[PDB]
Structure 1
C-alpha cells in the first residue's frame, strides 16, 4: 500500500505530465497521494495562469463577509456577518491597513502560533464563492474553468443524464481569514490555485480517519451536534492543531504559496487560514473513484447547509433514500 503514513505528498510535473489533468490525478493516487486527503502540485517552470494580475482591481465582491468567532482560542465557531460591496482594489487596501495587515513574524511556524493564539479576538473580512475565473482563456493546461464537469463524469459512469453545471469560484482573503473544518459537497474532490499574494496554511485529516475528527467535533460542539447529524456541513467549526494532537487525531499541515495548486481528495476533512491579502480560485471535480464516496456522503437536512440546485441531482441519483429529507431541509 502506497503512502501508509498518509503524508501530504508534493508533486513536480514536467510539461509533458501537465498535459492531461485526469491522467495526472490518477498518477498521484497510484503514488498514494489521496491517503493524506490533500496534495500539493507545483506547476512546470514554464507554465502561467495568466500574463499578469494588474487589471483585477475592478472585480466586485458583492457581499464581503466578516468572520466573527465564539468560543476559546483552540475550539471556536464563526459566523459570517454581511458587509457592504467593495471592489478587489478596495478590499486589498483594507487587507493592508493597520487594522488587518499581517503582523511582523519570524516564519510560517511563528505566524501559525500567532493565528491560533489571537484569531478569536479579531474579525477578518473576506470575499467568498464569487463565481468567476482568473485563468487566461489561452492557458491550456490546468485551467480550472476548462475541466470536465461532475455532471458529465456522473453520466459517463452511471449512464444518467442530469441537469446542472459547475464553474470555478474566486476567493479574496486577508490575514486570519479562516476556513472551517469540512469535506467538499458530496465529498467531491477540490482543486485550489493560489493566484496571488500571501500564503494559505492548510490542515487535513486522512480520509481513512475522517470519523475520528467527527467524533471529536461532536464532543467539542455538543449543542451543534445535537441540532444536526452532519453539522460539519455548516462549515463553522475550528479546532487547533494543539487540540487535535491532545485528542490523538491524525492530521497533517502544509503551506500553499502563490503559483501552487492544492488538490483535496474525497472525504478529506480540511481547514485553514490566509497569511495576508491573497486571491485563490477553486472548483470541485470528480473521478470514477469518487462515485462510491458520493453515495456514502453525509448530508445536512437541518437547513444550515444551503448549497445549490447543482447538488440536487447528485443527491437525487446517488442517494435516493436521503433525497426527500435533504430536499425539505433545502426548503
Structure 2
C-alpha cells in the first residue's frame, strides 16, 4: 500500500504532465496521495494562471463575513456576521490596516502559535464564496474554470443525465480568517489555487480516520451534536492541533504559498487559516473513485447547512433513501 502513514505529498509535474488533469490526479492517487486527505501540487515553472494581478481591485465582495468566535482558544465555533459590500481594493486596505494586519513574526511556526493563541480575541473579515474566476481564458492547463463537471462525471460513470452546474469560487482572506473543519459537499474533491498574497495553513485528517475526528467533535461540541447528526456540515467548528494531539487524532499540516495548488480528497476533513491578505480560487470536482464516497456521505437535514442547487441531483441519484429528509432540510 502506498503512503501508509498518510503523509501529505507534494508533487512537481512537468509541463507535459500538466496537460491532462484527470490523468495526473489518478497518478497522484497511484502514489498514495489520497491517503493524507490533502496534496500540494507545484505547477511547472513555464506555467502561469494569468499575466498579472494588477487589475483586480474592482471585483466586488457583496457580503463580506466577520468571523466571530465563541469558546476557548483551542476549541471554538465561529459565526459569520454579514457586513456591507466592499471592493477588493477596499478589502485589501482593510486587511493591511493596523487593526487587521498580520503581526510581526519569525517564521510560519511562530505565526501558527500566535494564531492558535489569539484567534478567538479578534473577528477578521473574509470575502468568501464569490462566484467567479481569475484564470485567464487562454490558460489551458489546470484552469479551474475549465474542468470537467461533476454532472458530466456522474453521467459518464452511472449513465444518468442530471441538471446542475459546477463553477469556481473566489476567496479573499486576511490574517486570522478561518476555514472550519469540514469535508466537501457530498464528500467531493476540492482543488484550491492560491493566486496571490500571503500563505494559507491547512490541517487535514486522513480519510480513513475521519470518523475519529467526528467522534471528538461530538464530545467537544455536545449541544451541536444533539442538534444535528452531521453538524460539521455547518462549517463552524474549530479544534486546534494541540487539542487534536491530546486526543490522539491523526492529522497533518502544511502551508500553501502563492502559486501553489492544493487538492483535498473525498472525505478528507480539513481546516485552516490565512496568514494575511490573499486571494484563492477553489472548485469541487469528481473522479470515478469519488462515486462510492458520494453514496456514503453524511448529510445535514437540520436546516443549517443550506447548499447549492446542484447538490439536489447528487442526493437524489446517489442517496435516494435520504433524499426526502434532506430536501425538507433545504426547504
User: What's the TM-score bracket when you normalise by the shorter of the two chains?
Assistant: over 0.9
The match for 2:286 is: 286
Q: Provide the rounded CA distance (Å) in 1 between the counterparts of 2:76 and 2:114.
A: 16
- Per-residue deviation at 1:309? 1.2
Other structure's SS at 2:262 match: strand
Q: Provide the rounded CA distance (Å) in 1 between the counterparts of 2:308 and 2:299.
A: 13
CA deviations 1:216-249 (Å, max 9, x no partner) are 0000000000000000000000000000000000
TM-score (norm. length: structure 1): 1.00
Q: Provide the rounded CA distance (Å) in 2 between the counterparts of 1:224 and 1:85.
A: 31
Q: Provide the rounded CA distance (Å) in 2 between the counterparts of 1:226 and 1:200.
A: 32
- Per-residue deviation at 1:16? 0.5
- Per-residue deviation at 1:169? 0.2
Other structure's SS at 2:29 match: helix
Other structure's SS at 2:52 match: coil
- Per-residue deviation at 1:323? 0.2
The match for 1:78 is: 78
Q: Where does the alignment leave 5 or more consecutive residues of structure 2 unmatched?
A: none
Q: Provide the rounded CA distance (Å) in 1 between the counterparts of 2:203 and 2:48.
A: 26
Q: Provide the rounded CA distance (Å) in 1 between the counterparts of 2:308 and 2:170.
A: 17
CA RMSD of aligned residues (A): 0.2
Q: Provide the rounded CA distance (Å) in 1 between the counterparts of 2:230 and 2:289.
A: 23
Q: Provide the rounded CA distance (Å) in 1 between the counterparts of 2:88 and 2:190.
A: 24
Q: Provide the rounded CA distance (Å) in 2 between the counterparts of 1:74 and 1:80.
A: 19
The match for 2:130 is: 130
The match for 2:8 is: 8
Q: Where does the alignment leave 5 or more consecutive residues of structure 1 unmatched?
A: none
- Per-residue deviation at 1:70? 0.2
- Per-residue deviation at 1:210? 0.1
CA deviations 1:175-199 (Å, max 9, x no partner) are 0000000000000000000000000
Residues 1-331 of structure 1 mapped to structure 2, 5 A cutoff = 1-331=1-331
- Per-residue deviation at 1:321? 0.2
CA deviations 1:92-136 (Å, max 9, x no partner) are 000000000000000000000000000000000010010000000
- Per-residue deviation at 1:31? 0.1
CA deviations 1:238-268 (Å, max 9, x no partner) are 0000000000000000000000000000000
Other structure's SS at 1:27 match: helix
Other structure's SS at 1:119 match: helix
Q: Provide the rounded CA distance (Å) in 1 between the counterparts of 2:230 and 2:300.
A: 5
- Per-residue deviation at 1:147? 0.1
Q: Provide the rounded CA distance (Å) in 1 between the counterparts of 2:191 and 2:111.
A: 25
Other structure's SS at 2:111 match: helix
Q: Provide the rounded CA distance (Å) in 2 between the counterparts of 1:95 and 1:246.
A: 33
- Per-residue deviation at 1:308? 1.3
Q: Provide the rounded CA distance (Å) in 2 between the counterparts of 1:220 and 1:261.
A: 32
CA deviations 1:264-296 (Å, max 9, x no partner) are 000000000000000000000000000000000
Q: Provide the rounded CA distance (Å) in 1 between the counterparts of 2:219 and 2:301.
A: 21
